[model samples]
Target chain A: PETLLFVSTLDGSLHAVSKRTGSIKWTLKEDPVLQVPTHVEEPAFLPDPNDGSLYTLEGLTKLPFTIPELVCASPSRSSDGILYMGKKQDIWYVIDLLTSPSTSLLYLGRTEYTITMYDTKTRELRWNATYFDYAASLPEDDVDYKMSHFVSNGDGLVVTVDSESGDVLWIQNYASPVVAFYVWQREGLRKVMHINVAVETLRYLTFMSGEVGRITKWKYPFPKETEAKSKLTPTLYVGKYSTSLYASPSMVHEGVAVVPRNYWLLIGHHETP
Target chain B: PETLLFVSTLDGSLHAVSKRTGSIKWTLKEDPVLQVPTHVEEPAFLPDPNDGSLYTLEGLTKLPFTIPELVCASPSRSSDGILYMGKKQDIWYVIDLLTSPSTSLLYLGRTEYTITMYDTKTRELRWNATYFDYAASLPEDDVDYKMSHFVSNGDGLVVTVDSESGDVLWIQNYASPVVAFYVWQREGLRKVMHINVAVETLRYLTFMSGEVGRITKWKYPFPKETEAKSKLTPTLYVGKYSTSLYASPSMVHEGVAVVPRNYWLLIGHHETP
Candidate 1:
């Protein structure tokens, strides 16, 4: 397969430069487009800002439905082969699609500081509830979608809700709402999955705020007494401002995380579950 | 100053959306340019891929010097107001120019597996040396500039060299060359600056690779004994791949760092000086 470097330049054209040979493979005479490339196995699509539908990059094949007009928009497909799409125009509609897909569940973060769950399998709306306050409400135009377990919004609020019951499982707040975050849940070895080790895989929530000069971590399966009222402490603080942080995290593993700040790539570690 | 969300869309124009009003403040009729915003005090410049010279985004006023053909090229102004520019073509020419503006010193990570120092104040070339092996040679087109402490390249090898005498202070190798890195040097308040506290202030180097799954940290000043031959051990190993890392660090303050990975914001802490 030819690895192509897709470029959307100011000349109102898109160029696929062959990475192997550093030569132009082909050029699309499309209007000036942002050129959002996707990781989908299928060919990537182009978000024609003027047109409401998604078009295949290769031939401009338009999809039937109108997509929310968002910057750098792309489609994500889950294991069930369902492509999840959400609101992009309104500030409220944009925040709610932070997480989706759990075999049978879909969670949405609404504008009114509420989270609504839907059972995709049964095509039924399960429950809805306010998770965070306006202080913790997401105020940004963009939100990241977590495919498996949880959902979050701007100014960062990590809220875990029960898909089957709509009951709020856990909620964590930040000094500054999170600009970016990461979560990992290692479900050791299942019954049918055999035994690998008696590892009590601990789920963790890690995030950093663009305005706050700190990186925080919270352990999962919060103690029954520490659920909604839990205010996790930061694991570390680098400097005094967001600009002092690294460009971003370079890698994260079982018990360690790496960040590039100042002039060094700092690697850090925490206790393993 | 108004907080503007600059958008360079496919319509061969630029839009400056006011964060306060959420209204289009102004639009530029320039060619389809990839709006490269700057943190410098002055207005940002536009990288017209078609033109070899830099131009002001508002008036398209060309800079006197012709910048190398680089993607996302933005001029960095040092304290002395010297705008540092470098080769953007020839792969070898691009690898160098990783760090500059250390008082009077400038460090360049060259393509021939070498690092060269230049005295910008005295207008003299200081010295050059091969810091890492070909296996760890930088293989990417992009490089981050570290103004105060150090410089690095792709595949990640962190090398600390003296700016005054060109002596190789220390060099550390990684299993994977770092795609991004961070370095910090706390000079502990000086004699003239008065003493804040009796702090040893250990300098550190932290970095992560886009291909490697580990985030590694090495104490700086390299223990005097561990120079170029030192093989530092990783502090922690995340999952098995780079994709497992977070979107990036939201904050890095003091000794704590926050990274958004998987669906959680992972915060990490390390021993501070």
Candidate 2:
């Protein structure tokens, strides 16, 4: 038999519900001031295979010894059954829930500022990495933030960078300030290369003066696309941000892709041979 | 055979040393910035057990990210082989030496202004339990910072209060926090009740008061020296600015009792646990 548990939200309100009936077992009101507000987009919750119980963590606030801007990602269970999550403090922690009557927790260690892995049973942290740094510090008034993740190439190359700071930071670091005058000309050739692996073709979506210019289709064997034209081979897309062109393959599906459903096509750029 | 690895101090001067020899191997200088003036301590080496090679992570900086007012703690290694360190920003980060070449690096998350655990490898955060918010917002002029870890009953009882608002967020939200605190306290008390665990039972050290108080020994199973005449157990002496404390029994070696070697216990009681 599966036992149900009742929990309260960041706001100090108790919610008791039956897992079997999905009915409200009890609703207890507590002090409203005790409630901690969390951003809705913060990642939380994990699917439990054993009893279908979703074990979630709550309650984060600014305390003397706490990390403030800590956001949570979906919890991950390692092969060993330990639970792990990316925290705001740029570290990972392990929790053991199987202990009878009482549970055990351990501070595994730090992870990349973006993501981390953990072993649930052993309560061990796996690894940490960082991709890029800001070329220069931004002004306090600049409302800017960074988000990064691991993009692995089977060849053992992990590329991590801030996509938001792509062209801006690059230009500030490498390109000359005078290059800003050529923005109009560069924007013309800024094309979106779309490669459909299932059909094995390359399509180009060009932008003229920051507006949709034209969509051009090319056959697989076209020279201008690949070897100037190698047919029947995979083609990658390259985007010119400032003076630097970011290169990525055109094909979308490759290996394990973790993302929201709607993001499938929007950011699809990986390919498999 | 053991291999050797070299690291540069905050001054950027490289110190070559062999792990097996525990002796200086060689010293080399390549860049002047390596000799820059900076306070550095607590250097951790993460070497792959399988290959005996040093794991290297690059391009991560805590200089701008840390809160500028506080002196940062030395780096430490997590269970997963990652290195954790903090900056004045009060943020902790994990660095992975293995994945940087081919994969995009990871960034865990950010803590609040406090130094609490930002990442817990679990989804849903228990924020309110560990933090304390003050009623008045800290003025921009006050830049002092501190961090320490919280020890509870080991049952996942997290207590958070807004440092500026004094609002308590959560308490005992998860089983792990409650159990961890309880287990730690019980284990420490079982050894010596009034012995300060924060300072490793060092005499004349009071963490809460930041003053040296005389050590008062209590008869086992009897209450003595504590404010309440309750049954006295070994007291884990914690300092106001300590990140975490090891319980008395936990700090004992076999049957030998060890005292802290330093005058002031250099640990985080303010922000970590």
Question: How do all models score by TM-score?
Answer: 0.16, 0.20
Per-residue lDDT of candidate 1, residues A142-257 (tens digit): 23311112212112233333333323344443232222221111111000100001011112332212112232233222222123213322122111122121111111224434
Model 2 off-target regions past 4 Å? Answer: A1-82, A85-114, A119-131, A135-273, B1-225, B228-273
- As a whole number from 0 to 100, the lDDT of residue A172 in candidate 2 is 11
RMSD, each candidate, Å?
29.8, 26.1
Question: What is model 2's native contact fraction?
Answer: 0.00
The parts of candidate 1 lying over 4 Å away from their true place are A1-273, B1-52, B55-70, B73-273
Q: List DockQ, one per candidate, in order.
A: 0.01, 0.02
Q: How close is candidate 1 to the true structure, as a TM-score?
A: 0.16
Candidates in order have lDDT scores of 0.24, 0.23
Residue-by-residue lDDT tens digits, candidate 2, B142-242: 22211111223212222322233322222212222111110011111111111112222211111312222124322111112232112323322222112
Best-fitting candidate, measured by TM-score?
Answer: 2
Which 10-residue span in candidate 1 chain B carries the lowest summed lDDT? B189-198
